[PDB]
Design a protein around this ligand. Structure first.
Ligand SMILES: CNC(=O)[C@H]1CCCc2sc(C)nc21
Lengths: 178, 244
């Protein structure tokens, strides 16, 4: 078993902490969803290979430009998150996060992950967004951004329903291994 | 950590830690506030536990078993004694506030109504100066500590055997030397997230809402000062590189 390091980056309301919690616990918390995520070491077996994957978050570090890069040393895979109910979080990806991740983690694979895909069919979400001349992020818009920034891949998941969560981390393990 | 404290914080939430008959007696909004307060203390207990692994297991273990060059162990774990003293004192006050709140005849049923006052004391005056001073020093030595760790693990056989031996137990799975250093650095930025969510459920008493609003502002002022005092130190960094 080899040791690989994954770091999840993205805006405050992109749902990155919820994604790490639902994966580390291996279910959606029924009694209390924690505010913070410390760290976790996942035992994953992808395509026959056994890997120890350390999971880290950048939550709380968004306004601290000299504290945040201390999370980057020795990263093997970057998860770049955005929320499908927030087209403004997708706009920050190419001009805010991508230049930073490429300077501190050159040559590291980046997977662009669209979170909260369940909200693409939420009526309250569509009503709130229409009041600001907006609509939930379309699948082709996510793929176009992942292409534009040179991502290893584009994936979608719902931390609330657990759909696509196992697959994002199995794929991240594969990217960390290449 | 000590067994008394581990059992008091073994549950996933305050609603699961207290007796179900005690829980039923409280309003939903109190339960929600108490769950976040329980998380603040539980993660502070874990943070203090990380600092004890760095001082007792790694640092002292290296000093009493290896023949490393003088000053090498200091470079691997900078400010760990000062950090452990700051956080063990803060945890001591958090645990004493919980213990005063326990019902008579009970070691698990409690409600913490006042917390802002304690957070204002921690994040103000000389205690805030010592946290600011210690974290600016720690976070500027973070990169140099990791590089030194990587050099020693790659070149010294006795260091490699020591690391493999003391980190072999399952309870140390996510607590290697590099994990402890990032766990410590990331800790300070978790406080505003925890305090803002406690504040979200503390509007019932106006004095409490105001004390937490002040404490939130104090933590953000401290984080801004720590962030401005950071400059990564490099092993063998020339003067020309530093002043340019
Ligand atoms: C601290 N900020 C938040 O939004 C809280 C309040 C709602 C519940 C959750 S889940 C999470 C990671 N944070 C929060």
């Amino acid at each position: 078993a080899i040791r690989k390091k994954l770091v999840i980056v993205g805006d405050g309301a992109c749902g990155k902490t919820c994604l790490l919690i639902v994966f580390s616990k291996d279910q959606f918390p029924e009694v209390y969803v924690p505010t913070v995520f410390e760290n976790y070491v996942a035992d994953i077996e992808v395509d026959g290979k056994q890997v120890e994957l350390a999971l880290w978050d950048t939550a709380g570090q968004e306004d601290y430009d000299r504290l945040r890069p201390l999370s980057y040393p020795d990263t093997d895979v970057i998860l770049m998150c955005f929320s499908i109910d927030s087209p403004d979080s997708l706009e920050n990806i190419p001009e805010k996060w991508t230049p930073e991740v490429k300077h501190f983690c050159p040559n590291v694979p980046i997977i662009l992950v669209g979170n909260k895909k369940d909200l693409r069919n939420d009526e309250h979400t569509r009503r709130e967004l229409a009041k600001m001349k907006q609509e939930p992020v379309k699948p082709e818009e996510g793929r176009d951004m992942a292409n534009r920034i040179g991502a290893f891949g584009y994936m979608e998941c719902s931390a609330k329903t657990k759909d696509g969560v196992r697959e994002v981390f199995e794929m991240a393990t594969r990217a960390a291994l290449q | 950590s000590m067994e008394m404290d581990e059992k008091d914080f073994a549950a996933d939430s305050w609603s699961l830690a207290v007796d179900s008959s005690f829980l039923q007696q409280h309003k939903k909004e109190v339960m929600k506030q108490q769950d976040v307060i329980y998380e603040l203390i539980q993660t502070e207990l874990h943070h203090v536990r990380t600092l004890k692994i760095m001082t007792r297991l790694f640092r002292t273990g290296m000093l009493e078993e290896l023949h490393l060059e003088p000053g090498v162990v200091q470079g691997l774990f900078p400010c760990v004694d000062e950090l452990s003293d700051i956080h063990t004192r803060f945890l001591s006050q958090l645990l004493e506030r919980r213990r005063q709140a326990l019902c008579p005849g009970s070691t698990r049923n409690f409600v913490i109504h006042r917390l802002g006052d304690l957070l204002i004391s921690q994040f103000s005056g000389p205690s805030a100066e010592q946290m600011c001073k210690t974290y600016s020093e720690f976070c500027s030595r973070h990169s140099k500590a990791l590089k030194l760790y990587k050099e020693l693990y790659a070149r010294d056989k006795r260091f490699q055997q020591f690391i493999r031996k003391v980190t072999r137990p399952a309870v140390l799975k996510r607590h290697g030397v590099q994990e402890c250093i990032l766990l410590v650095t990331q800790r300070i930025t978790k406080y505003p997230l925890l305090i803002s969510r406690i504040l979200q459920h503390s509007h019932g008493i106006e004095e409490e809402r105001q004390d937490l609003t002040t404490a939130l502002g104090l933590v953000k002022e401290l984080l801004s000062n720590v962030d401005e005092g950071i400059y990564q130190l490099e092993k063998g960094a020339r003067l020309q590189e530093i002043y340019n």
